[PDB]
Amino acid sequence: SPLAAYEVDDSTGYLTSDVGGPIQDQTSLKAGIRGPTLLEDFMFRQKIQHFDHERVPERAVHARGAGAHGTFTSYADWSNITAASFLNATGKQTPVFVRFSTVAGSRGSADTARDVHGFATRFYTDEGNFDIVGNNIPVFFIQDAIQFPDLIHSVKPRPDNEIPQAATAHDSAWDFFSQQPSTMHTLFWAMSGHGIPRSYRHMDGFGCHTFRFVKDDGSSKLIKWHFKSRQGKASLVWEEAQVLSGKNADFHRQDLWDAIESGNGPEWDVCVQIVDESQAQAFGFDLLDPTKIIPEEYAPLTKLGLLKLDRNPTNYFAETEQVMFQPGHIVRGIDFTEDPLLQGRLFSYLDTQLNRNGGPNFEQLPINMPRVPIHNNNRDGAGQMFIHRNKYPYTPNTLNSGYPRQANQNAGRGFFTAPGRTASGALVREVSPTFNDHWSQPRLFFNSLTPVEQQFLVNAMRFEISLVKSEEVKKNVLTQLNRVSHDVAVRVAAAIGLGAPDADDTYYHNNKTAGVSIVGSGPLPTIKTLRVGILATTSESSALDQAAQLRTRLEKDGLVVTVVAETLREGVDQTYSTADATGFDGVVVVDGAAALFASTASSPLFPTGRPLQIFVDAYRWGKPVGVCGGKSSEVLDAADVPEDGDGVYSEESVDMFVEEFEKGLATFRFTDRFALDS
């Protein structure tokens, strides 16, 4: 590991300058005890110069994100489908680093903004670094990389006032979506629960583009990358995400950090869809078009290996902030396709690192280094950390005996372009007519959601478009939505008091596809790491005993338990003052704490109505909630929470309460609590 050599231990020792001279750093050097600071104070200036220069430009997109180390393990020798060395043996392990992100927000913006999310994975392979720079949504808004600044300017804050942060809920974004109909598929995904995932662990990763697997014999197949979560799929609801943005902007990065620290490092099956070159247009769309999925009914997933994240960084800046992904980080056995979005990405990711790093030697940062020898004639540049021994860095040479040697299909395990690839025709700035259906697959996605998930997506569009000031942009939005679904256009129009256009059935259909629904993906396969808030009181010795009971039961099953009370003490983790329903996946009130839930209840130690507000918010947001201990009756009445409700638990027995409640945690959300359009 190039990181091991660069770890710096400051657990002992005297303070030094950056050149090893022992110094102090607490008082400036002055001309007398009340005098002016001296220019000759090098201790002051070296420390303050460093501080003054700590920041680097944030990523132009995906600025908000968090990373972890782990391991990829191949399930098989995949030589039969690719030459890729990291996939060439059963059990072969490759170190990884992953960064997850949002897209639009700056640094410091909230994790739980509604957005597309990044899922970028580096494989430090034995034949070079290989990055799969993916998103949690399989389709992208645009069909040509040249349009990326148009999309990103439109979603980012308006440039006169830089409002709003981390949001599409403004005129410019919806102007762009309504004028550029390619955007509909990703927009539908972003307006679904996929826009507000419960955690980075509860979302999938997608390469989006078609790539190629290339064998050593030169043959190739077309692939899509799918990283399928072993934790299951889960979402927040919007009114919860909005509160969580304020209460804990760091929720997704803490969730990931904690899961790794507790030995619950998240896992994905790294999968591909594999199809023949001859099927590029066989599925009713073009595989070069990054606004399209291959429905799993036409091409099943093959599991290639296991990705596990199991180690947090040491220094966030050095590792997470400085990791510099590139789809140009490719290895023998993988090739590009003529997807015009992918094509332009290859340029952008090499160039943008110059902005971030300030110089050309960014691959020398430890997080960016490979785990094999580097042999090339790249030289000099600001920040050059190598001392090259070859004083003849040109090819062809005799004075270095012809080294380094060219690598290609028949030498040195070189990368090679798939040799069956061709190009024909005019040099054109023209869009393929094969790309022109912008509406069928958005309809397929919408059809594939459950009725309450459809309602959530309509409600997200109603929320955002109601904040668009331009009546004209709003009419144009309804025109495009109407081409996907007349019903969606009518339901969205109702919230903004406009009439939807008449049905236009050109692209309407009733087809569905597996694997895109969150609500329909069934109970979570594991409840480990899910958060249970136990609302208790210091008033009643009964209440802390009940809490301690529930804690033992729930912690045995790997749940993260928080006992909440008025004040901290033995067994209490959190005060009411700092507690919020956004902090829990389930909420339990111990019946000993009933008095805290009365309308008349007041304390200087927390805001008026806090304990009850936690319970009511948890219920209203669809979470499993209950009262444990025998007078389950009251509390449920204070909350107007019906005791016969699905996901509402009422038991005197802790054993019975927990058994029932944990089934609620797997269900995760009780969708019967949300009203549907008639």
Catalytic residues: 62, 135
Among 150, 171, 277, 487, binds Ca ion (CB under 5 A): 171
Contacts with a copy of itself, 272-291, as mask; x by CB under 8 A: --------------x-x---
Q: Give me the least distance between CB of 52 and Ca ion, in Å please.
A: 14
Under the binding rule (CB under 6 A), the answer on residue 365 touching ligand HDD is no
Among 16, 42, 316, 642, binds a copy of itself (CB under 8 A): 316
SS3 at position 279: helix
Starting at the edge strand found earlier in the chain, the sheet holding 574-575 runs 574-575, 560-565, 531-535, 586-590, 625-628, 648-651
* Residue 406 labelled as part of a binding site: no
Among 82, 85, 109, 135, binds ligand HDD (CB under 6 A): 135
Interface region with ligand HDD, contact rule CB under 6 A, candidates 251-259, 338-346, 510-518, 624-632: 338-346
Q: Give me the least distance between CB of 208 and ligand HDD, in Å please.
A: 3
Among 228, 230, 475, 620, binds a copy of itself (CB under 8 A): 620
119 contact partners, CB below 8 Å, separation of at least 6:
98, 100, 134, 135, 136, 200, 203, 204, 205, 206, 227
Under the binding rule (CB under 8 A), the answer on residue 623 touching a copy of itself is no
Among 93, 315, 352, 539, binds ligand HDD (CB under 6 A): 352
Interface region with Ca ion, contact rule CB under 5 A, candidates 71-79, 187-195, 539-547, 589-597: 187-195
Q: Give me the least distance between CB of 521 and a copy of itself, in Å please.
A: 23
Q: State the DSSP string of 80-94.
A: TT---GGGBSTT-EE
Query: Of 489, 457, 486, 488, whose CA–CA distance to 476 is shortest?
Result: 489
Interface region with Ca ion, contact rule CB under 5 A, candidates 333-341, 517-525, 568-576, 637-645: 517-525
How far is residue 233's CA from residue 515's CA, in Å, rounded to a whole number? Answer: 10
Under the binding rule (CB under 6 A), the answer on residue 348 touching ligand HDD is yes
Q: Which tokens in the block code for residue 218?
A: 């030169």
Q: Are 298 and 283 within 8 A, CB to CB?
A: yes
Q: Give me the least distance between CB of 400 and a copy of itself, in Å please.
A: 29
Among 57, 383, 414, 523, binds a copy of itself (CB under 8 A): 57
Q: Which tokens in the block code for residue 503?
A: 């049905």
Q: Which is nearer to a copy of itself, 513 or 538 (CB)?
A: 538
How far is the first Cα of the chain from the last one, in angstroms, to the nearest whole number?
Answer: 60
Residues in contact with ligand HDD, counted by CB under 6 A, come to a total of: 29
How far is residue 519's CA from residue 542's CA, in Å, rounded to a whole number? Answer: 38
Under the binding rule (CB under 6 A), the answer on residue 611 touching ligand HDD is no
Among 118, 193, 265, 622, binds ligand HDD (CB under 6 A): 118
Compute, in degrees rounded to 10, the torsion defined by CA atoms 496, 498, 502, 507.
Answer: -30
Amino acid at 550: L
Among 55, 303, 379, 509, binds a copy of itself (CB under 8 A): 55
Q: Which is nearer to ligand HDD, 52 or 570 (CB)?
A: 52
Q: Give the total residue count for the chain.
A: 678
Under the binding rule (CB under 6 A), the answer on residue 623 touching ligand HDD is no
Among 91, 246, 420, 522, binds a copy of itself (CB under 8 A): 246
Q: State the DSSP string of 174-243.
A: HHHHHH-GGGHHHHHHHHSGGGSBS-GGGS-EE--S-EEEE-TTS-EEEEEEEEEESS---B--HHHHHH
Under the binding rule (CB under 6 A), the answer on residue 616 touching ligand HDD is no
Among 70, 128, 193, 624, binds Ca ion (CB under 5 A): 193
Under the binding rule (CB under 6 A), the answer on residue 214 touching ligand HDD is no
* Residue 311 labelled as part of a binding site: no
Q: Which is nearer to ligand HDD, 148 or 174 (CB)?
A: 148
How far is residue 456's CA from residue 53's CA, in Å, rounded to a whole number? Answer: 45
How far is residue 574's CA from residue 533's CA, in Å, rounded to a whole number? Answer: 10
How far is residue 568's CA from residue 134's CA, in Å, rounded to a whole number? Answer: 43
Under the binding rule (CB under 6 A), the answer on residue 253 touching ligand HDD is no
Q: Which does 235 bind (CB under 5 to 8 A by kind): ligand HDD, Ca ion, a copy of itself, none?
A: Ca ion
How far is residue 334's CA from residue 417's CA, in Å, rounded to a whole number? Answer: 9
Contacts with a copy of itself, 538-567, as mask; x by CB under 8 A: -----------------------------x
Q: Are 294 and 287 within 8 A, CB to CB?
A: yes
Q: Are 186 and 141 within 8 A, CB to CB?
A: yes
Q: How many C-beta neighbours within 10 Å does residue 511 have?
A: 12
Q: Give me the least distance between CB of 182 and a copy of itself, in Å please.
A: 11
How far is residue 216's CA from residue 46's CA, in Å, rounded to a whole number? Answer: 54
Residues 581-610 that bind a copy of itself (CB under 8 A): 599, 602-605, 607-609
Q: Which does 171 bind (CB under 5 to 8 A by kind): ligand HDD, Ca ion, a copy of itself, none?
A: Ca ion
> Which residue number is nearest to Ca ion in terms of Cβ?
193
Angle at 210 between CA 277 and CA 350, to 5 degrees: 130
Give the pairing of strands 625-628 and 648-651: parallel
How far is residue 249's CA from residue 112's CA, in Å, rounded to a whole number? Answer: 7
Query: Of 92, 56, 57, whose CA–CA distance to 74 is shortest?
Result: 92
Interface region with ligand HDD, contact rule CB under 6 A, candidates 17-25, 59-67, 189-197, 396-404: 59-67
Residues 433-492 that bind Ca ion (CB under 5 A): 456
Q: Which is nearer to ligand HDD, 120 or 648 (CB)?
A: 120
Q: Which does 249 bind (CB under 5 to 8 A by kind): a copy of itself, ligand HDD, Ca ion, none?
A: a copy of itself
* Residue 59 labelled as part of a binding site: yes
Under the binding rule (CB under 6 A), the answer on residue 59 touching ligand HDD is yes
**Which residues make beta-bridge pairs with 210?**
none
* Residue 85 labelled as part of a binding site: no
How far is residue 626's CA from residue 535's CA, in Å, rounded to a whole number? Answer: 10
Q: Which does 62 bind (CB under 5 to 8 A by kind): ligand HDD, Ca ion, a copy of itself, none?
A: ligand HDD
Binding-site annotation, residues for Ca(2+) = 235, 363
Interface ranges with ligand HDD (CB under 6 A): 48, 52, 59-62, 65, 99, 101, 118, 120, 133-135, 140, 145, 148, 208-209, 290, 323-325, 341, 344-345, 348-349, 352
